[PDB]
Amino acid sequence: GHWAPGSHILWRYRENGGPHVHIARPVTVVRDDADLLAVWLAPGTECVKPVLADGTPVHLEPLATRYTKPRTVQRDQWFGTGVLKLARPGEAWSVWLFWDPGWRFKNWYVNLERPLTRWEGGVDSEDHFLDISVHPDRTWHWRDEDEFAQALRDGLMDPASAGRVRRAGRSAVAEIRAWGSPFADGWEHWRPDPAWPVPSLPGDWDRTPA
């Protein structure tokens, strides 16, 4: 079934090549139907993110060991402006919209990922490392090609899995070139309902349904 707009759910990613949740983001459902799930991640929301086992930031670990060193999780608020996330059921990416203060639209962000799986409390995925940035002038470029390369070097991905990610990348680029959904759909002009509260991080944010 579908969640009513205004519902609170969790949007989650598992650790790379493991079963445990490492990213958990409480979000408000904007739209949920057979064609699209859209959610709003508000500024200040309490989230879960990965850190290295010593609590230090993943991004600061050299690439050579960034994906080999032991990790844990940390609660942290969503910094900066809120993000709108959009995902077609069954599709191997979601598209997130980023704005600067004053709702100055910055870019669409194509997050290549395992198609979201729905469960009672939200949606779960696995990030595929490679991303795409799309600018308001319709141009585009890759992000994190080097992290994608590193992940395959460390066996976080098979040649076959990597191939599937590259295929997804080509399909997303095809949509960008054609200016299809959701790029063409004016979500850059969407605004959250000011009455919506900031959703809480559930104490059981890490539960994994069978």
Which residues contribute to the annotated binding site for Mg(2+)?
Answer: 111, 127, 131
CB closer to Ca ion, 45 vs 111: 111
Report the nearest approach of ligand GP2 to the CB of residue 210 (Å).
27
Q: With CB under 5 A, what is the number of residues at the site for Ca ion?
A: 4
Instruction: Give yes or no for residue 15 binding Ca ion (CB under 5 A).
Output: no
Report the nearest approach of ligand GP2 to the CB of residue 125 (Å).
11
Q: Which residue is nearest to Ca ion (CB)?
A: 144
The answer to whether 128 and 166 are in contact (CB under 8 A) is no
Report the site for ligand GP2 in 110-169 (rule: CB under 6 A). 111, 127, 129, 131, 143-144
Q: Which amino acid, 121?
A: G
The answer to whether 123 and 113 are in contact (CB under 8 A) is no
Number of other CB atoms surrounding residue 134 within 10 Å: 21
Number of other CB atoms surrounding residue 30 within 10 Å: 21
Give the whole-angstrom CA distance, residue 80 versus residue 12.
19
Instruction: Give yes or no for residue 60 binding ligand GP2 (CB under 6 A).
Output: no
- Find, among 94, 147, 145, 144, the residue nearest to 117 by Cα: 94
Interface residue list for Ca ion (CB under 5 A): 111, 127, 131, 144
Which residues of the shown chain bind ligand GP2 in the complex (CB under 6 A)? 78-81, 111, 127, 129, 131, 143-144
